[PDB]
Amino acid sequence: VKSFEIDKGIYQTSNFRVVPSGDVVRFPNITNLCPFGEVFNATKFPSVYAWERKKISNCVADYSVLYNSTFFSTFKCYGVSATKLNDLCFSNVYADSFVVKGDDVRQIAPGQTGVIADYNYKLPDDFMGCVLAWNTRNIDATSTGNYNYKYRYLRHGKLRPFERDISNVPFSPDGKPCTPPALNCYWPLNDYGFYTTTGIGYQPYRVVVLSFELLNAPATVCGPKLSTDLIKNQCVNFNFNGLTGTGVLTPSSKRFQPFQQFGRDVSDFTDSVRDPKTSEILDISPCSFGGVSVITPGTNASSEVAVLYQDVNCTDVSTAIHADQLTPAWRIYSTGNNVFQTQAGCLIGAEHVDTSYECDIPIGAGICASYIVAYTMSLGADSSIAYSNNTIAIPTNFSISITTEVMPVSMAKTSVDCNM
Amino acid sequence: SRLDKVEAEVQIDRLITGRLQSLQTYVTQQLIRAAEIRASANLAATKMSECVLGQSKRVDFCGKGYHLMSFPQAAPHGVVFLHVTYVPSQERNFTTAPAICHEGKAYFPREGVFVFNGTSWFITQRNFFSPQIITTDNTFVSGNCDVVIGIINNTV
Amino acid sequence: YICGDSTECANLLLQYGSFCTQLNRALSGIAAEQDRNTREVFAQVKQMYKTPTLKYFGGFNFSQILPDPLKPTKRSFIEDLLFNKVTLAICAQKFNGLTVLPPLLTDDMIAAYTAALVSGTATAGWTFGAGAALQIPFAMQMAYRFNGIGVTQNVLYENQKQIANQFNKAISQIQESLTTTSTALGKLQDVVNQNAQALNTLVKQLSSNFGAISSVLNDILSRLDKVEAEVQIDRLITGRLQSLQTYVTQQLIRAAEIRASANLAATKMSECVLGQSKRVDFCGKGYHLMSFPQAAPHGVVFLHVTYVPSQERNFTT
Amino acid sequence: YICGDSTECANLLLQYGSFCTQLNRALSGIAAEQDRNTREVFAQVKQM
């Protein structure tokens, strides 16, 4: 409050929260090496009109062979980041392989159609992984000509995403099953013309699309991480198959489903997860938090304070103090007693007193402090009256008692130069 | 010193947007404080027109007693009333009867209760103890002696 | 609420100054003002009396008006009907950040206040408040209450049984018309429903996006590297901050309306309960012979004992 | 008012939660309470 003299009253101050202690990772026990060395160092690679979609599952990826190599010409990720890619056990990743020219890197994106990405290979607008292309001018590009790879450029309409046309239909703009070489009746197929000593834009590129079906299954393709064991009823960190966080774990009470994995209880609040090693645990991610508040008698009759924690049960508070876990970590700090009821929280440094007073200081629910004591409350001077018959009190002597009263009628007449 | 182009115009847009939300917040909350302060000022004008200019018979509005007078004083930004109240306290014990059955007929007193049947002597005021000798002006003819609870004779 | 916990999103929060201090101060001031409202309404009797435990005077059943020692709870029966009527649409622990703190003046203390007010109304004479009491046997009280109405004292004593029967039947009809009835207790549920709408809308605004990639933190944390991180996190912080500040402004406006109603309530418990307020169609709707308080969820429920005469005749003057 | 109508600007308005619903509810509550203002001022007589 930026003062030295500070009067008597509960004064709100900073926020307390329990620092998490442990570190818990729970992955599946699946161990394998991925076919990345298979698919990226391969011989047969299809064209764009017959792009091949390979499933990878039940593996342990590394994601450092992707980085610790200058084999890669253009490597751009869309939905994810580069370095933090092996922190998520994916679900059934898909490798889409094809071979393009030295020009078509600009097309392959969410949107940005062009020609071939409009006619031969269409992406969705959100669900992307990582797109990679590299130059292969020294394998298949003969300067005589590589006339073995084709594309299609004649389609009645554009594409829905992840859809592949193969059938050589005799393209005619009005239906019309034709016999090419009739007029306006061609084949949609067309070569490339891959040469060796030509320009860089005419050089063959190999393109791998990594679509990441994020976590619509119990995840299989993990990264090189090590799992620990469950630490129940204690604030720790998380890293499950695709989920991080910070919380307190406990067994469940669910009628959970075999395909389900998450809990998202009311509105994207996870609260219950299914362990990758055969259990189902709830998640109180609120370890403990709130705001502390100082009770002081007023720095002119005392100098001893009492800290009120707000939404606690005085059981995590004792452990978090006596193991140094609270974010308002002190240096000169002790605990003689611990008053707790009237659910407004831990009242550190007070005494239950049955002899209740006129409620000096408003603590929470009924309870009021003083002086340092913390009684509940005397609501008023308790009495009973004789309620018999005809006998009647009448005042005989009176008094006059001039009383003050305060009414504010005018706040500060302010103004703002709203250009300065 | 180190700005170049529309980059800095983005940065100054961020600064203007933050300061403009802060100023808008200031204006809105001072408007809310102005609404509360003018509600209080309307109460204050009401108390000056009521408590000071006359004896306002409404209870626990002006003072805490029975509001005999009122004296205003100015203040920094405010106003301070001095309610001259009236607090009666030396309680007693005296019996009563709600009626007087003199000769078979009801004498209720005056709208202005407590017939002093403290040994059947007087009829007083409500608040200040003031016995008055009972006469025919102090009551009225009312029916017969059917609902009289306490019989009092010798109505003079 | 803003930025649950990461490490660096708190730093991006500190890049927007000191809003969290402002919001905590504004809501604490609102909470203190609501406690002030309850103190100003209810805590107006220092001298808390005791229930006389007769609850029947002349013909006046104060049954179910005052609480009963024989019943387990210390609240009266009509208050229990009112508590049953108003819906709500260890400790709480939810990582919204949100909380509902409990009230200071707790509900049985509220009921003790209401019983004290009704007792000192029924007992303790007309001079209640400024003073202590007068030991008036409650027939003399409403014999006197027939004089702020412009009738004589003949009305009460000559008609005692009929007045008592109409009074008791009226209270029993109030019971029957509060048990199985309907939205003529609406305003308190309007308060509770609007609180629920505001708070649930706030939580849904956490569930929403603000033009970012995901609508939740710790997801984009898993796929953050650098400034893109700070782009999406700044978008989320800005959106959540505008939503929360809008919430704070509307809470303050609802607090203003609720304290206007609180000032009216304190005014009526001063005027109507503690004496006979001769101003017309302010306390009740007849001539305001009496008035009683009763507690409520988050409100106050009066009972105005009015006076409506209707058997007209024809007489020349 | 916000985003008169195009195609996708409506979707960017959808990206900002349910602000449109909040404002409509607020103005509707204003309308109903001022109907209550007029009723509690003028309609105070049972028998016209």
Q: SS in 3 state form for D1-48?
A: CCCCCCCCHHHHHHCCCCHHHHHHHHHHHHHHHHHHHHHHHHCCCCCC
The residue behind tokens 């292309």 is A133
- The total of other beta-carbon atoms located within 10 Å of residue A107's CB is 18
Q: Are strands A130-135 and A189-190 parallel, antiparallel or unpaired?
A: unpaired
Q: Tell me how close the Cα of C68 comes to any Cα of chain B, in angstroms.
A: 30
Q: How far apart, in whole angstroms, are the C-alpha atoms of residue C16 and residue A386?
A: 65
CB contact at 8 A, A380 and B48? no
Cross-chain CB nearest to B85 (options A390, A397, A403): A403
CA angle B84, B89, B90 (to 5 degrees): 150
Element (H, E) at C10: helix C9-14
Cβ pair A363, A295 in contact under 8 A: yes
Which amino acid type is present at position C222?
A: S
Whole-number CA gyration radius for chain B = 33
Neighbours of A134 (CB within 10 A): 17
**Neighbour-count burial of C39, counting CB atoms closer than 10 A to its CB (0-12 exposed, 13-18 middle, 19+ buried):** middle
H helix intervals, A83-193: 116-119
Closest Cα partner for A103 from A155, A39, A50, A48? A48
Residues with Cβ < 8 Å from A60, sequence gap 6 or more? A30, A31, A32, A33, A34, A221, A222, A223, A224
Spatial strand order in the sheet of B122-123: B115-116, B122-123, B132-133
What is the DSSP-derived secondary structure letter of residue C102? P
Three-state DSSP at C267 gives helix
Against chain D, the chains showing at least 3 CB pairs within 8 Å are: C
Task: Return the residue matching tokens 């001769």.
Answer: C278
Q: Measuring CA to CA, which residue among A178, A362, B54 is closest to residue C109?
A: A362
What residue of C is the nearest CA neighbor of A264?
C207
Closest CA relative to residue A366, chosen from A343, A338, A339:
A343
Q: Name the DSSP class of C95.
A: T
The CA distance from C268 to C251, in Å, is 25
CA proximity to A167, closest of A188, A192, A182, A153 = A188
Amino acid at A349: G
Which residues are bridge partners to B101 per DSSP? B106
Q: Count other Cβ atoms within 10 Å, centred on residue C128.
A: 23
Give Cβ neighbours of residue C17 (< 8 Å, ≥ 6 apart): B18, B22
Burial classification of residue D32, based on how many CB atoms lie within 10 Å of its CB (0-12 exposed, 13-18 middle, 19 or more buried): exposed
Q: Chains B/D: 3 or more C-beta pairs closer than 8 A?
A: no
**Extended strands (E) in A289-417:** 289-295, 306-308, 338-339, 347-348, 361-362, 368-369, 374-375, 381-382, 398-399, 402-408
Contact B96, B115 (CB under 8 A): yes
Contact C271 B61 (CB under 8 A): yes
Structure tokens at A412: 């500060």
What contacts C310, CB < 8 A, 6 or more positions away?
none
C204–D17: do the CB atoms touch at under 8 Å? Answer: yes
The whole-angstrom distance between A406's CA and the closest CA on chain B is 5
Contact B77 A410 (CB under 8 A): yes
Residue from C138, C167, C136, C143 nearest C157 by CA: C143
Tell me which residue in B26, B45, B88 faces A395 most closely, judged by beta carbons: B88
Q: Residue B66: closest CA among chain A residues belongs to which residue?
A: A400
Radius of gyration of chain C (CA): 27
Q: What are phi and psi of A257, to 5 degrees?
A: -105, 155
Collapsed DSSP state (helix, strand, coil) of residue A182: coil
Burial class (CB in 10 A: 0-12, 13-18, 19+), C120: buried
Give the rounded distance of the alpha carbon of A286 from its chain centre: 15
Phi and psi for C262 in degrees, rounded to 5? -70, -35
The tally of CA atoms less than 13 A away on the side-chain side of residue B134 is 23
Specify whether the CB–CB gap between A155 and A187 falls below 8 A. Answer: no
Neighbouring C-alpha atoms within 13 Å toward the C-beta of A33? 5
Cβ atoms C3, C221 nearer than 8 A: no
Contact in structure between A16 and A328 (CB atoms under 8 Å): yes
Among C134, C283, C149, C267, smallest CA distance to B62 is for: C267
Q: Which of A150, A200, A145 is CA-nearest to residue A46? A: A150
C132 vs B39: CB contact, 8 Å cut-off?
A: no
Task: Tell me if A208 sits within 8 A of A246, measured CB to CB.
Answer: no
Place of tokens 């660096």: C8
Structure tokens at C211: 């033009």
Paired strand residues for A284:
A248
| CA pair distance C85, C296, nearest whole angstrom | 10
Q: At what angle do helices C19-42 and C107-122 cross, to 10 degrees?
A: 30
| A76 membership: H or E segment, kind and range | strand A74-77
Burial class (CB in 10 A: 0-12, 13-18, 19+), A195: middle
Cα angle: D38, vertex D42, D44; to 5 degrees: 120
Q: Does B17 touch chain C (CB under 8 A)?
A: no
Q: Would you say A188 and A146 are in contact if contact means Cβ atoms under 8 Å apart?
A: no
- For A409, which of B44, B82, B114 is closest by C-beta distance? B44
After which residues does chain C break, using C–N > 2.5 Å? 89
Lookup: tokens for C187: 């305003």
Residue B65 forms contact with C (CB below 8 Å): yes
Q: From start to end of B28-150, where are the E strands? A: 69-74, 78-84, 87-88, 115-116, 122-123, 132-133
Which residues are bridge partners to B79 per DSSP? A407, B74
Coil, strand, or helix at residue A133? strand
Return the number of other C-beta atoms located less than 10 Å from residue A246's C-beta: 20
**Structure tokens given for A323:** 């193991």
Q: How far is CA C5 from CA A50, A239, C240, in A?
A: 47, 15, 14
The phi-psi region of residue A324 (left if phi > 0; otherwise alpha if psi is between -120 and 50; otherwise beta) is left
Say if CB A342 and CB A366 are below 8 A apart: yes
- Read off the amino acid at residue D36: R
Question: Which is nearest to A366 in space by CA: C105, C295, C281?
Answer: C105
Cβ pair A233, A281 in contact under 8 A: no
- Is there a contact between C288 and C277 (Cβ–Cβ < 8 Å)? yes
Å resolution of this model?
3.9
Give the integer Cα–Cα distance in Å for A130 and A210.
Answer: 5
Closest CA to A240 of A266, A261, A264, A211: A261
Q: Do C210 and D16 touch (CB under 8 A)?
A: yes
Report chain D's C-alpha Rg in angstroms: 18
Selection from A333, A47, A313 nearest residue A194 by Cα? A47
Q: Do A407 and B44 touch (CB under 8 A)?
A: yes
B chain contacts of residue A407, beta-carbon cutoff 8 Å: 40-41, 43-44, 47, 78-81
Instruction: Please answer yes or no on whether B87 and A414 come within 8 Å at the CB atom.
Output: no
Say which residues have a Cβ less than 8 Å from residue C95's Cβ, sequence separation at least 6: A247, A269, A285, A286, C4
Q: Give the closest of A284, A342, A382 to C48, CB-based.
A: A382
User: What is the distance in angstroms between the Cα of D14 and the nearest Cα belonging to chain C?
Assistant: 9
- CB-CB neighbours of A142 under 10 Å: 10
Chain D: which residues have CB within 8 Å of chain C? 12, 15-18, 22, 25, 44
Q: Please indicate whether, in this complex, the C-beta atoms of B86 and A412 are within 8 angstroms of each other.
A: no
Cis peptide, bond prior to residue C293, ω within 30 of zero: no
Q: Under the phi-then-psi rule, with left for phi > 0, alpha for psi from -120 to 50, and beta for the rest, what region is C298?
A: left
Spatial separation of the C-alpha atoms in residues A226 and C185, rounded to whole Å: 61
**Four-residue CA torsion sign, B56, B59, B60, B64:** positive
Q: Which residues of C touch D44 (CB under 8 A)?
A: 281
Structure tokens at B12: 């100054």
Local structure of A54: helix, strand or coil: strand
Q: After which residues is chain B broken (C to N over 2.5 A)?
A: none
CA pair distance C127, A195, nearest whole angstrom: 112
CA angle centred on C40, ends C39 and C44, rounded to 5°:
90
Cβ of B42: how many Cβ atoms within 10 Å?
Answer: 12
Contact C274, C252 (CB under 8 A): no
Instruction: Answer yes or no: do B98 and C140 touch at CB < 8 A.
Output: yes
Neighbouring residues of D23: CB distance < 8 A, sequence distance ≥ 6:
none
- A376 and A332 in contact (C-beta within 8 Å)? no
In whole angstroms, give the CA distance from residue A93 to residue D27. 49
D17·C197 Cβ contact <8 A: no
| Phi, psi angles (nearest 5°) of residue B149 | -85, -45
Could you tell me the sign of the dihedral formed by the alpha carbons of B56, B58, B59, B64, in that order?
negative
Choose the closest CB to C45 out of A17, A380, A384.
A380
Which residues face A273 on adjacent strands? A281
The SS3 of residue C13 is helix
Strand partners, A272: A282
Q: How far is CA D5 from CA A37, D9, D11, D18, D21, in A?
A: 51, 7, 10, 17, 17
Query: Is the four-CA dihedral B102, B108, B112, B113 of positive or negative sign?
Result: positive
Q: Which helix (H) or strand (E) holds C202?
A: helix C186-207
**Residue reference for tokens 């202005």:** B112
| Contact assessment for residue C63 and residue C51, using Cβ atoms and an 8 Å cutoff | no
Token pair 């040469």 is at which residue?
Answer: A195
| Strand locations in C39-181 (E) | 47-48, 56-57, 60-61
C212, two tokens = 């970012």
Closest C-alpha among C132, A398, A384, A391 to residue B93 = A391
Q: Quick count: other Cβ atoms within 10 Å of Cβ B70? A: 23
Q: Which two tokens stand for residue A101?
A: 């020219």
Distance in angstroms (rounded) separating the CA atoms of residues A180 and A184: 8
Q: Per the structure block, which two tokens stand in for C296? A: 């409520």
| Neighbours, chain C (3 or more CB pairs < 8 A) | A, B, D
Helices C186-207, C228-268: axis angle to 10 degrees equals 170
Which chain B residues have a beta carbon less than 8 Å from that of A391?
93-96
The residues, ordered by sequence, that sit 6+ positions from D2 with a Cβ below 8 Å of its Cβ are: D13, D20
Q: Up-side HSE of residue A6: CA atoms within 13 Å toward CB? A: 15
Task: Tell how far CA A43 is from the center of its chain.
Answer: 40
- The Cα–Cα gap between C138 and C62 comes to 12
